[PDB]
């Protein structure tokens, strides 16, 4: 029973490890007076004017380019 | 790497019931004084900081003299 108990937590751990990873690399910092745009190269760029704020931005999609 | 982490992690004794819960709580408590920590910027005085709100822009009416103002973390 102990030995189930401790891969379960490792598994557990694991994908908790994995998923800090990915929401950490879905945020940016675009210092104000830097207005950000989103990097979307899904459907582009934002004319929704995705300015200053750390707007989720999706990985592999929108890098942030930080706009002065 | 992960497995390292995997280990370490499922190596935590299996204490009784109350160690869980205060584990938990500690953790609570790290995060909110993390974002206590966090939740005032870097300030120079000759440098009125002032809020930025997140809508509508810089607070042209906000003037910040000198003075406690809290930034609302990410906003």
Redesign the interface.
């Known amino acids: 029973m102990?030995a189930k108990?401790?891969?379960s937590?490792?598994?557990f751990?694991?994908a908790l490890?994995?998923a800090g990873g990915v929401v950490n690399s879905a945020l940016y910092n675009v210092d104000?007076g830097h207005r950000a745009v989103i990097f979307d190269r899904f459907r582009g760029v934002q004319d929704i004017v995705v300015g200053?704020?750390?707007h989720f931005l999706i990985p592999w999609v929108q890098k942030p380019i930080i706009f002065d | 790497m992960?497995?390292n982490?995997?280990?370490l992690?499922?190596?935590?004794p299996?204490g009784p019931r109350g160690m869980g819960t205060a584990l938990k709580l500690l953790l609570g408590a790290g995060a909110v004084a993390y974002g206590v920590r966090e939740s005032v910027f870097t300030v120079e005085g000759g440098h009125r900081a002032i809020f930025?709100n997140?809508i509508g822009g810089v607070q042209q009416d906000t003037i910040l003299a000198e003075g406690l103002h809290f930034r609302i973390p990410?906003f």
């Open positions: 102990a108990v401790f891969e937590i490792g598994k751990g694991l490890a994995v104000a200053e704020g750390t | 992960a497995q982490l995997k280990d992690a499922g190596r935590l299996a930025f997140r990410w």
